[PDB]
Amino acid sequence: GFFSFIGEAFQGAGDMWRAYTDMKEAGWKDGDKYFHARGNYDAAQRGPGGVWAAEKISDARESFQEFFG
Amino acid sequence: GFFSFIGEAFQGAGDMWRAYTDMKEAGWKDGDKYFHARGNYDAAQRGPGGVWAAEKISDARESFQEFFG
Amino acid sequence: GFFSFIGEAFQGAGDMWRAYTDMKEAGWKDGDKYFHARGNYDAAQRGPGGVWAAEKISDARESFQEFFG
Amino acid sequence: GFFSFIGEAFQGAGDMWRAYTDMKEAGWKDGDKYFHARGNYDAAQRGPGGVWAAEKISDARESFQEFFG
Amino acid sequence: GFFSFIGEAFQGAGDMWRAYTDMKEAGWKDGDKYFHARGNYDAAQRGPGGVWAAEKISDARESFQEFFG
Amino acid sequence: GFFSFIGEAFQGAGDMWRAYTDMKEAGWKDGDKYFHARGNYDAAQRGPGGVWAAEKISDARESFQEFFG
Amino acid sequence: GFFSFIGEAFQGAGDMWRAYTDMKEAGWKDGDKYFHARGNYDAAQRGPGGVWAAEKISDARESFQEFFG
Amino acid sequence: GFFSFIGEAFQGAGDMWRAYTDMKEAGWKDGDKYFHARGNYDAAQRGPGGVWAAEKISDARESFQEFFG
Amino acid sequence: GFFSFIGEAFQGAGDMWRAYTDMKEAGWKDGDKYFHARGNYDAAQRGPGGVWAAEKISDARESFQEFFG
Amino acid sequence: GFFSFIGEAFQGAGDMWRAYTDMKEAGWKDGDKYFHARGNYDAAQRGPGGVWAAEKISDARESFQEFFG
Amino acid sequence: GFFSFIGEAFQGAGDMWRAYTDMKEAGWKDGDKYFHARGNYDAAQRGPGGVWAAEKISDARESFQEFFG
Amino acid sequence: GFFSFIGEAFQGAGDMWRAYTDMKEAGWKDGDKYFHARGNYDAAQRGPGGVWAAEKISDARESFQEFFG
Amino acid sequence: GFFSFIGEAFQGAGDMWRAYTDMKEAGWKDGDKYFHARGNYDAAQRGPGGVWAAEKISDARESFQEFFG
Amino acid sequence: GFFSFIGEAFQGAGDMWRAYTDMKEAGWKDGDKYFHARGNYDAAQRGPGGVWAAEKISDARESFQEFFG
Amino acid sequence: GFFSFIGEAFQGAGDMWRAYTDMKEAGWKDGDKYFHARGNYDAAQRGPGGVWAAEKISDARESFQEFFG
Amino acid sequence: GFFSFIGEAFQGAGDMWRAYTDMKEAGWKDGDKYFHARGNYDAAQRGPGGVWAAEKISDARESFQEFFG
Amino acid sequence: GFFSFIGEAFQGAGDMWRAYTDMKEAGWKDGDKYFHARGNYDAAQRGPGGVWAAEKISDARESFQEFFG
Amino acid sequence: GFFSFIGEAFQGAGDMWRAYTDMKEAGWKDGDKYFHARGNYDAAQRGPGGVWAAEKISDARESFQEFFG
């Protein structure tokens, strides 16, 4: 099994990027969540990029190349 | 089993990047979560990049290359 | 089993990067979490980069190279 | 089993980078957590880099190279 | 078993980098945690670098090289 | 078993880098934790570097090299 | 740039399987060659086979098999 | 740049399997060659086989097999 | 740049399997070669086999097998 | 840059398996070569085998096997 | 840069397996060579085998095996 | 740069297995060579075997095995 | 190859009358050349003469004569 | 190879009359060359003469004569 | 190889009349060369003469004569 | 190899009349060369003469004569 | 190898008439060379003469004569 | 090897007429050389003469004669 959580350039309150497995006879309660923003500038940004998501990669040659300037 | 949590350039309150496994007869309670922002500048940023996520990578040659300037 | 938590350039209150395994007859309570920001500049930043996440990497040649200037 | 927690360039209150395993008949309580920021500059930053996360790396040749200028 | 906690360039209050294993009939209480910042400059920073996290590395040749200028 | 805690360039209050193992019939209480900063400059910094974390390294040749200038 | 010479189940006299390269200001003579056979039985024989000649073979998968039953 | 010479199950007299290179201001003579066979039985024989000649073979997987039953 | 000479199950007189290189101002002669066979039984024989000739072989996996039953 | 000479199950007279290099102002002669066989039984024989000739072999895995039953 | 000479199960007279290098202002002669066989039984024999010739072999894993049953 | 000479199960007269190097202003002669066999039984024999010739072998793991049952 | 370089009454910096033959895998560089001449009288002078270039001159009778005066 | 370098009444810096033969894997560099001439009289002078270049001159009778005066 | 370097009445700095043969894996450098001439009379002078370059001169009768005066 | 270096009435700094043969794995350097000439009379002078370059001169009769006066 | 270095009426600094043969794994350096000439009369002078360069001179009759006066 | 170094009427600093043969694993250095000449008359002078360079001179009759006066 493969579990991968990735996060970048974000504003959150709570409860994020959670993994629960192999459980029995459990129980849980979560809390209220409030987000309040006033007068904020130049926030929550990421620059250019690429995203690749896969299970198997086999015999990659001269690939997955990225160039900027 | 593979569990990978990654975080960069973020503003949070709580409860993030959590892994629970192999549990029995458990119980839990979480708390309220508040996020308040006023008058903030140049926040929560990441620059250019790339993301690769996979289980198996086999025989990679001259690849996964990144260039900036 | 492989568990990897990574964090960089962040502002948080609590409860982050948690791993719970192999448990029985347990119980727990968490606390409220507040985040308050006013008048803050040039915060929560990371520069250019790359992210690679995987389980197995086999026979990598002239790869996973990064260049800046 | 492999457990790896890494943190860099962050501002936190508490409860971070926690590992609990092989437990029975346990119980615990956590405390409230407050984060307050006013008038702060040039905070919570990391420069360019790369991140690699994996379980097995086999026969790596002329790879995982990083250059800056 | 392998447990590795690493921290650099951070401002915290408490409860960080904790490992609990092989426990029975235990119980514990944690305390409230407050973080307060006003008028602070050039704080919580790390320079360029790289991060590698893995379980096994086998036959690495001319790799994991980093250059700066 | 391998337990490794590393810390550099940080400002903390308490309760950090803790390892508890092989316990029975134990109990403990922790104290409140406060962090207060006003008017501080050029604090909590680390320069360029690299991080490698692993369990086994086998037959490394001309690798794990770092150069600065 | 290679020279391959393979011979099986032949009846010869001489002057066979020559590779001459990088000759300058040379000179020579080869004599005479007599072959005489009288009354021979069941000679110069080979069984079944598969013959392959090439310069470059890439990424072959589940191929070049021979079965005899 | 190599020279391979392979011979099996041959009846010869001489002057076979020569590799001459980098010769200058040379000179020579080879005599005469007589082959005479009378009344021979069951000579010069080889069984089944597979023959492969090449310069470069890359990333071969589950190939070049021979089965005899 | 190598020279390989392999011979099995041959009846010869002489002047075989020569590798001459880097010759200058040389000179020579080779005599005569007589082969005579009368009444021979069951000579010059080899069994089944697989023959491979090459210069470079890379990353071979589960290949070049021979089975005899 | 090497020279390999291998011989098995041969009936010869002489003048075989020569490697001459780096010769200057040389000179020579080789005599005559007589081969005579009468009434020989069951000579010059080899059993099954697999023959491989190469210069470079890299990262071979589970290969070059011979089975006889 | 080496010279390998291997011989098994041969009937010869002489003048075999020579390696001459770095010769200057040389000179020589080799006599005559007679081979005579009459009435010989069951000579010049070798059993099954696998033959390998190479210059460089790298990172071989679970290979070059011989089984006889 | 070495010279290896190996011989087993041969019937010879003489003039075998010579390694001459670094010769200057030399000169010589070799006589004649007679081989005579009449009525010999069951001579010049070797059993099964595996033959390997090389210059460099690196990082061999679980290989070059011989089994006889 | 015949090479006849002949020079009379000439002035140069360098790189004159060069003969390169039978070269391999060789590289070379020739620096820059300056020729400065000022205030010089009666330079680079050859008297009268005849010039002959040929390969084969057979049965020349009373020919190729130069009568001065 | 025949090389005849001949020079009379010449002025140079260097790099003249060079003959390179039978070279391999060789590299070389030739520095820069300066030739400065000022205020010089009666330089680089050769009297009268005839020039002959050939290879074969057979049965020359009363030829190739130079009568001065 | 025949090399005839001949020089008469010449002025130089260096690097003249060089013959290189039969070289391998060799590298070399030649420094820079300066030739400065000022205020000099009657330099680099050769009287009259004839020049002969050849290889074979057969049955020369009363030829190749130089009669001065 | 025949080498005839001949020099008459010449002025130099160095590096003249050099013959290199049969070299391996050798490297060398030649420093820089200066030739400064000022105020000099009657230098580098050779009287009259004839020049002969050849290899074979057969049955020369009353030839190759120089009659001065 | 025959080497004839001959020099008459010459002026130099050094590095003249050198013969290197049959060298291996050798390295060398030659320092810089200065040749300064001022105010000198009647230098580097050779009278009349003839020059002969050859290899084989057979049956010379009344030839190769120099009659002065 | 035959070496004939001959010198007449010459002026030098050093490094003249050197013959190196059959050397291995040797390294050497030659210092710098200065040649300064001022105010000198009648130097480096040789009278008339003939020059002969050869290898084989057979049946010379009344030849190679120099008649002065």
Numbering used by the authors:
A (entry chain Q), B (entry chain N), C (entry chain K), D (entry chain H), E (entry chain E), F (entry chain B), ...: 1 to 69
According to the publication:
Chronic inflammatory conditions, such as tuberculosis, leprosy and rheumatoid arthritis, are risk factors for the development of systemic AA amyloidosis. We report three cryo-EM structures of SAA1.1-derived amyloid fibrils: one that was extracted from the diseased murine tissue and two that were formed from murine SAA1.1 protein in vitro. In vitro and ex vivo fibrils possess parallel cross-β sheets but differ in their overall topologies and fibril protein folds.
The second most abundant fibril morphology (morphology II) represents the majority of the remaining fibrils. Using cryo-electron microscopy (cryo-EM) we obtained the structure of morphology II, complementing our previous structure of morphology I22. Morphology II is polar, C1 symmetrical and consists of three protofilaments (PFs). The PFs are referred to as PF-A, PF-B, and PF-C. The arrangement of PF-A and B in our model is relatively symmetrical and similar to morphology I. The PF-PF interface is formed in both cases by reciprocal ion pairs between residues Asp59 and Arg61.
